[model samples]
Target: SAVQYFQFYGYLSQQQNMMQDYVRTGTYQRAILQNHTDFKDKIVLDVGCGSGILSFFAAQAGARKIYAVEASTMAQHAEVLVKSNNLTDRIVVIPGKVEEVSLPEQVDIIISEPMGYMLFNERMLESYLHAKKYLKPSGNMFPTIGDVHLAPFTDEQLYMEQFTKANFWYQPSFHGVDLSALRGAAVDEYFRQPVVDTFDIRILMAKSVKYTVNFLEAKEGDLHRIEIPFKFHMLHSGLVHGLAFWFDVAFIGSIMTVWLSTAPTEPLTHWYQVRCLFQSPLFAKAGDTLSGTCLLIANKRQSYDISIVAQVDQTGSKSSNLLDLKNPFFRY
Candidate 1:
């Protein structure tokens, strides 16, 4: 168990950019903790405490007792870190999944950076929601909320590189052979999944709200399947290569709210961005309005089957399946 779990976070931590982003800018996290008044002597829980960094932050912020829960063997490193920092008395390192551990008391606040692709890819949302039972009624959750947004975007270079090349590579006749034999497989392999990379924000024609999540009011079942219909007025369309998806997470206090946004328009983060390329880029022009629905279904392995379906043929259909966001099409 420990080996598999360790290997898990190990691969993720290898992407130095992601870990470095949080370590460098400790913004809202530091803001809330260092604010002092509320954090002083507060009971805090840091979920998935990779390296115990957040636990240490809580300790420095004056938390009376900090529970750092990490399922990986990195928990061993966390223990050593706590000892080295002389925070052992204040922060306790729990070496197993949070669900498997017990706490003497409910916490005053629960904080974590448990986000993954499209925000729900890692299944940490379920753990965060479950942790609510260990919190006091007046307790708060940092990143009190999260939202997923969709935007119509066009990236000619990426489209030419990832889309065209992926298919055309199989088309160029080579020595009298119909090389196009592999075209279908190549396209499916390349476009079926969203690309986890970054792009310039200028590529977006327009964006619209699709999913809004208020963690305090959210349930585990809420994400088992998500269907959202979105409409965007193209600012200046070029080509519809794919849809761009990103999220904004916020921490709230009595006086203000701060955020860690992964928008292409915002400062860079480890998430880069998520783009779902279509097999064929739609020929779109300026002054056009685009409408689509995003479908996400969680599976047994705890990942999502995500897709975007568009209504491209003009006479808009209000009676389309896009209007039905309540049904679950993919089940475990």
Candidate 2:
């Protein structure tokens, strides 16, 4: 049962299907089809070629030879799609992981949508780095660069309210049992409120030199920090549901770009959504200043293993009775 749960929720259910659908029929696909001209005879590799849509795009772009590599049973579906679309002559479905799949010859471009929430979840950076080493010296990476951002917000009152509701549950059974006295003692002792400040970040990449986050000026063991100030427009005070972030990387060789988002407001894409925990609770009014810093640590040798840390602190406070009430159902 554990294995089944791990397999289903771990892999299949975690991946974003709607986003995949967007890639299949959105402007992203259209732009890839319309813009690039080098695909006519260049060798292309599509890693994690789910559903073979991107592989087909490469073929449509006129790639001389396209290798579609997949690590799941979906690879069989990709094979069938290739044959039915008559792209078998141009697209070759390799049913294996990128680390194991062998190409007939050196590839000119390695295209993949490996970015995850906050840009590190799926470990695509490592895979892409490996692909780059095996590529020609002049080869190019689709997403040339990326950046992370952060901001802080207060949410102490929200947590206190949630805690108050939890107290009501114990009142009915122990009526006239001096439960109110216990409530006061329990609120300050038993309850450890969640005081959190949310920080959000995003990564953007593009084909041309016009849009990119260049690390050229960067060196080994370099640490970079970006401090940003933001404001939260909340209609009503509620639990600061943590922070949300996303990333978008582009494969320039053929005008193909891939975007990844985390804990998006619309719908959940990947199971590994972005939600940073805070060391303490923060309380704020309608208009409060939420500021923080985003720290990125880059290791030269292990470029893909860069670490990102977010620190947020809130300022200012407003009065609200919402915090006095407690909820029993809410748990820290």
Candidate 3:
């Protein structure tokens, strides 16, 4: 199962397992708290303001006015939260899309937790980009920048765990029966999407950057389709699954920048790591070469369709195609 699938529901529907999300993004929150002076008397816009956490954070930082914009009923909870804290006068709960709402005055800062898997999944970024028109020329965004990163990793042990999850076909064989016929469709849906889990940092031999989207300069169209070509040299010998995607979101100020990188090396978050599992694991040596192309396309239903196509050359030997991952964008 995707590690955060349950965590995702817990977060949006019930607010459970949100501690992990909060714990993972603590640095950014601390950055706001430590630099509250910047928010003093400044108007702020909280885009996709789920439960108005960022709005409250800005209120604590002394924001003069805050627009907590959300499209869900959670905005109702945010209104009550703001009222209960007596910050209702400071925070205005706007129950609609930020891009669609009307602002009385330009915002000095636009802030929100608006990242999905691989930093582009939720596709709310377009809304934020749209809302920028309402920002003062000198205003800043909460998360100044974000980038998608890739690492070739191998984890046979983890693969076994996932494979077994879809092995209900094995159930019929318990008494020497054969229900293998029914297993195909079940397993297909099970592994259709990349598995989300925390992998050993050691599994990732080297890192290659896929793309960087700067909110300050990027247009909405820039995120539609991205093609990054790269290669990685294996640092350890093992079976190679495929490439993995993660992101680093940062709040950059002229004087300081706070970053939250959800890499395996970092403390685990609900948004741990998302991987494109190779249908067939390939072999590689300690010094083998793995080359690939990572394609990030806009997903119509969600955020972005993310995948990579790769091939491996074991220890300078002839290259054998590892994963031909076309039609491989399983929803995150």
Candidate 4:
């Protein structure tokens, strides 16, 4: 899925810098570090220990033993880090999935920043859960809890402007506008909506964003379909272009947010943004009931996968698209 690929690539590219900053300052370190003081003799297991920064942190904390488990090219980099830090004896780097690796002894602490946008973006929860089962009863998890937030807003002018541009370029005769100047402009302005609502999803899981969306619920064997009735409180009059969404996920103690304008940020975090396009524009006045249904479906199986299908019905019309971009493993 695009979401998974984007997040994975984003982290691989930028996360190392964030880790370096944390090790240097130890201020924005993961939450688990706040409670632990001396790691001199503690056995620490760093799952998905990209670049081995956390392993080094444990070593710096005085850990007697540290196991750094990673499953990507980052693992090779981690080995180099361990040797450069002269922690080869203390930090053991395991280059494979956590499930396939075995530790000689139970760990005193299990630390990993497996969270993704919307909480379960990378499906890191499954790995964390497995690690927890093998962990000593007294061991602590890095992040104890997670949270998600939501809000509503209005943006009509944004959408109208986009509509005019799209029509001008595609159907130039309709407005007698020059086609050359508007050729590529339409793509840029297309689906520009006045954001009528804003909501944030905070995934508390190790790798994915897992949350219960209460906008509407589905039943057993039911083909779920519901209109997303958006009631906009228009601050100004403008065209309704489309709806935008975004999310954030926290790992260890640091948070990562993604958005359109702001790509992705960590250590110094930013928000992850998502924009949903509409087939047509919907003009509305203040206090208008923008009724629409967001369809959903849950397949029957050993592990059911729930899919979301949204259709917006407004101004005596309808618009929709199939949204299959979800975390493959944690699709419920």
CA lDDT, every model vs. true structure: 0.72, 0.47, 0.71, 0.48
Candidate 3 residue lDDT tens string, 1-332: 22333234324445444534676446757767777866888999888777777788788888899988877666777788888999978999988767578888889888877777667766678888878888899788878888888887777765665568667785767578886776776555554466666766877866655577889887777777777777777777777776777888888764577788887778877677777776667677767778767777775454455555667754433222222222333333
| Decoy 2 TM-score against native | 0.57
Q: Which of the predicted structures, 2 or 4, would earn the higher TM-score when compared with the native?
A: 2
* lDDT at 300, model 4: 24
lDDT of 1 by residue, 1-332 (tens): 33553467744455345457863347745656645655789999888887877777777778899888887767787788899988889999887778788978899988787787678776788888878888899888876998898887788776666556566757566776787878767655655556677777888877556588888888878878888788777777577777878888877765567777888777767666777766566655566667777888776555677767765545442222111112211211
Stretches of model 2 off by over 4 angstroms after superposition: 1-16, 23-27, 154-243, 251-273, 282-332
TM-scores for candidates 1 onward, in order: 0.86, 0.57, 0.82, 0.55
Candidate 3 lands at a TM-score of 0.82
Q: Model 2 Cα displacement at 201 (Å)? A: 12
What ranges in model 3 sit over 4 Å off?
A: 1-13, 160-188, 208-210, 313-332
C-alpha-based local distance difference test score of model 2: 0.47
For model 2, the run of ten residues with the poorest summed lDDT: 202-211
Against the true structure, candidate 1 has what lDDT?
A: 0.72
Worst 10 residues of 4 by lDDT: 201-210
lDDT string for model 4 (101-204, tens) is: 88888887777765443333345655765676556765645543333322222344443555565665665464665575665555443432222222232211
